[PDB]
Every structure is written in C-alpha cells, then in structure tokens.
Design an enzyme around this catalytic site. Structure first.
Site, PDB file in Angstrom:
ATOM      1  N   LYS A   1      -8.498  -2.164  -0.287  1.00  0.00           N
ATOM      2  CA  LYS A   1      -8.151  -0.762  -0.112  1.00  0.00           C
ATOM      3  C   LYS A   1      -8.762  -0.244   1.198  1.00  0.00           C
ATOM      4  O   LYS A   1      -9.986  -0.215   1.350  1.00  0.00           O
ATOM      5  CB  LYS A   1      -8.630   0.042  -1.324  1.00  0.00           C
ATOM      6  CG  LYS A   1      -8.192   1.501  -1.349  1.00  0.00           C
ATOM      7  CD  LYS A   1      -8.528   2.169  -2.681  1.00  0.00           C
ATOM      8  CE  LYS A   1      -8.199   3.648  -2.651  1.00  0.00           C
ATOM      9  NZ  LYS A   1      -8.141   4.220  -4.029  1.00  0.00           N
TER      10      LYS A   1
ATOM     11  N   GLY B   1       0.740  -1.272   0.000  1.00  0.00           N
ATOM     12  CA  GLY B   1       0.000   0.000   0.000  1.00  0.00           C
ATOM     13  C   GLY B   1       0.763   1.312   0.000  1.00  0.00           C
ATOM     14  O   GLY B   1       1.993   1.330   0.104  1.00  0.00           O
TER      15      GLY B   1
ATOM     16  N   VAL C   1      -3.945   2.758   1.795  1.00  0.00           N
ATOM     17  CA  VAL C   1      -3.374   1.527   2.342  1.00  0.00           C
ATOM     18  C   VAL C   1      -3.946   0.293   1.625  1.00  0.00           C
ATOM     19  O   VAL C   1      -5.010  -0.201   1.985  1.00  0.00           O
ATOM     20  CB  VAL C   1      -3.610   1.409   3.879  1.00  0.00           C
ATOM     21  CG1 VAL C   1      -2.737   0.310   4.477  1.00  0.00           C
ATOM     22  CG2 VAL C   1      -3.339   2.741   4.584  1.00  0.00           C
TER      23      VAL C   1
ATOM     24  N   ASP D   1      -8.558  12.542 -12.461  1.00  0.00           N
ATOM     25  CA  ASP D   1      -7.208  12.367 -11.923  1.00  0.00           C
ATOM     26  C   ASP D   1      -6.490  11.196 -12.577  1.00  0.00           C
ATOM     27  O   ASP D   1      -5.866  10.362 -11.895  1.00  0.00           O
ATOM     28  CB  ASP D   1      -7.237  12.176 -10.407  1.00  0.00           C
ATOM     29  CG  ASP D   1      -5.915  12.535  -9.749  1.00  0.00           C
ATOM     30  OD1 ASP D   1      -5.573  11.892  -8.723  1.00  0.00           O
ATOM     31  OD2 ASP D   1      -5.224  13.463 -10.262  1.00  0.00           O
TER      32      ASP D   1
HETATM   33  O1  LIG Z   1      -4.568  -5.142  -7.622  1.00  0.00           O
HETATM   34  C1  LIG Z   1      -5.018  -4.043  -7.296  1.00  0.00           C
HETATM   35  N1  LIG Z   1      -6.285  -3.668  -7.464  1.00  0.00           N
HETATM   36  C2  LIG Z   1      -6.428  -2.424  -6.998  1.00  0.00           C
HETATM   37  C3  LIG Z   1      -7.550  -1.596  -6.950  1.00  0.00           C
HETATM   38  C4  LIG Z   1      -7.460  -0.310  -6.417  1.00  0.00           C
HETATM   39  C5  LIG Z   1      -6.241   0.152  -5.930  1.00  0.00           C
HETATM   40  C6  LIG Z   1      -5.116  -0.677  -5.977  1.00  0.00           C
HETATM   41  C7  LIG Z   1      -5.191  -1.971  -6.510  1.00  0.00           C
HETATM   42  C8  LIG Z   1      -4.284  -3.025  -6.698  1.00  0.00           C
HETATM   43  C9  LIG Z   1      -2.902  -3.153  -6.427  1.00  0.00           C
HETATM   44  N2  LIG Z   1      -2.160  -4.214  -6.774  1.00  0.00           N
HETATM   45  C10 LIG Z   1      -0.884  -4.052  -6.399  1.00  0.00           C
HETATM   46  C11 LIG Z   1       0.246  -4.867  -6.531  1.00  0.00           C
HETATM   47  C12 LIG Z   1       1.484  -4.444  -6.039  1.00  0.00           C
HETATM   48  C13 LIG Z   1       1.603  -3.201  -5.417  1.00  0.00           C
HETATM   49  C14 LIG Z   1       0.480  -2.386  -5.285  1.00  0.00           C
HETATM   50  C15 LIG Z   1      -0.760  -2.814  -5.775  1.00  0.00           C
HETATM   51  C16 LIG Z   1      -2.029  -2.253  -5.800  1.00  0.00           C
HETATM   52  N3  LIG Z   1      -2.304  -1.055  -5.286  1.00  0.00           N
HETATM   53  O2  LIG Z   1      -1.358  -0.335  -4.607  1.00  0.00           O
END
Ligand SMILES: O=C1Nc2ccccc2/C1=C1/Nc2ccccc2/C1=N\O
Length: 273
Positions: free
Chosen positions: A31, A14, A17, A113
C-alpha cells in the site's frame, strides 16, 4: 525492488495505490502513499486473525505498507451475489466481522469506517483493513461514502463510542441479506432522511438525547414511521432480524456490543472455533 526492514519486495491492483508483490522467498501486498504512520502504530497494537496483519514498512522520500495478501474484498463478493448470500455464509462473514471489531474495542480502538471494501477475504476467512480513520481512545481525531455512518455521528456527535462501528456492522449485515446497500443516500444531505425513511424518524420521547445533538437543533426532519422488518428484509429468520434490529437502534446506549452480538441465538449453530 524496494527494501523493507524485514525483506525485499508485482501487479497493479490499486485505488483511491495498492500493488501485489513478491517476497525474496511469499506473496504480500504493498500500500503506497500522516494517516499512514497512524495506521502502523494502530496496526502493531492489533494482532488478530480477523485483522489484516502488517508485516513490514518501506520508507522512501513515499511510504509503503507491506501487508499479508488477500484475494478479494466483500465489495466484490456482493457483486457476485446480487440478491444476497447463503445463510450459512452471512453467518460466517458476520461472525468474523464481529470478532475483529470486538478485538479493536477491547484494545480501545474504533475502525470508524467499516464497509464491504474495507473487509478483505482470503480463499480459505475475513479481515478488517484500512485503519486510516481509526480512533484510539484518548487521542484526538485528525471523499468517503456516508452509507455506513451512525446517525448520531452524521448529526454531529464527536463522542468516543464503540456503538459507532456496530451501526456499520448492522448496515453490512443487512447488505449481505438483500445483496443491496441498506441506506444508499443519493447525496450527503439525503443520508439521515434516507435512514429515517426506513427506520422511522427518532423522537425525543424515546431517545431524549437527540435534542442535544448539533444538527438536530439546526435542522428539522420529516417524520416517518418505521418500515416493518418484513419489507426491508423479506423472509429472513426471526433471530437474524432480532440481531439486526439490536444493531440498528438509534440510541447508542441501547445498541448491542460486538461481544454480546457474538452470543446472540442467531449464532447458536455456528462453531465459535
Ligand atoms: O491483499 C490485500 N491486502 C491488503 C491490505 C490493505 C489494503 C489492500 C489489500 C489487498 C488487496 N488485494 C487485492 C487484490 C485485487 C485487487 C485489489 C486488492 C487489494 N487492495 O486493493
């Protein structure tokens, strides 16, 4: 183990987070945290292969949004490709970006954004995420990088306009070609100057409605000519340049729509599926 409304739900990944998570059966993303309830109502309205889908919600006395899992974001793809991406790929990513954003605009919603890290990609295919600042048409609006913001917004425009996201798509399009951010203003006050130093300062003769913008009356700007597309994005195909230039024009009424951009000859060779 936290109970959602659909299922029970684990590494930490995160920022700002976000965790990784396991279903009782499938990999998801969690999230953690106002702009969250907004994000649920908006995301329920947006069901599209190019919009990261919300699958569940967990309420505790902290809100957790459960999302489909996504390997990476475009911020990270640009770090593996420091001089840009293959023409095959730019086309692919850009097209999917336009398709998601077009869906938003058909549904009367603006992301507002867009930027590489808000674009997630799975290992198969790219999707819009983070609708925290999204604007539903008719509902009033209620830190960040200013590098992908439309010049008129930066100049105090408050008006609802689909054009606001197309500017951001433009900056992303350019970023995928050079590998580098198009308008990386050093401070917040340098953003408009940075923009004009490359695209030229707008003039009231061609665009009569800058004059009506709050920060135009309160500030004068150094007058630049446009840098030829030749030096901004060296060696890129004419069709691409034409499209990018139609994404980056100052006049929001002249700027191309997501849907029209999908029909540009630059996308002649791509399967629309
Ligand atoms: O797989 C994801 N679906 C999401 C939907 C909303 C926000 C983030 C994600 C998300 C994320 N996958 C990740 C893999 C490695 C590092 C950070 C994230 C991440 N977010 O940091």
């Amino acid at each position: 183990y936290f109970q959602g409304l659909m299922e029970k739900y684990l590494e930490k990944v995160g920022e700002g987070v976000v965790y990784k998570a396991k279903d009782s059966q499938r990999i998801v993303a969690l999230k953690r945290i106002s702009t969250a309830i907004r994000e649920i109502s908006l995301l329920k309205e947006l069901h599209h292969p190019n919009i990261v889908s919300l699958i569940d919600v967990i309420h505790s006395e902290c809100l957790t949004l459960v999302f489909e899992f996504m390997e990476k974001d475009l911020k990270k793809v640009l770090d593996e490709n420091k001089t840009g991406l293959q023409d095959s790929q730019i086309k692919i990513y850009l097209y999917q970006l336009l398709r998601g954003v077009a869906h938003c605009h058909q549904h009367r919603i603006l992301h507002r954004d867009l930027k590489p890290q808000n674009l997630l990609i799975n290992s198969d295919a790219l999707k819009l995420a983070d609708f925290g600042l999204a604007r539903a048409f008719g509902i009033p609006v209620r830190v960040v990088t200013l590098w992908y913001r439309a010049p008129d917004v930066l100049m105090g425009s408050k008006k609802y306009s689909t054009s606001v996201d197309i500017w951001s798509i433009g900056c992303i399009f350019a970023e995928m070609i050079t590998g580098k951010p198009l308008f990386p203003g050093v401070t917040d006050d340098d953003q408009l100057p940075k923009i004009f130093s490359i695209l030229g300062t707008p003039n009231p003769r061609e665009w009569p409605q800058v004059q009506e913008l709050p920060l135009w009356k309160q500030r004068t700007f150094q007058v630049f000519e446009k840098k030829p597309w030749s030096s901004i994005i060296p060696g890129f195909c004419q069709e691409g340049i034409d499209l990018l230039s139609n994404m980056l024009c100052f006049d929001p009424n002249k700027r191309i729509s997501a849907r029209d951009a999908m029909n540009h000859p630059y996308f002649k060779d791509l399967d629309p599926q």
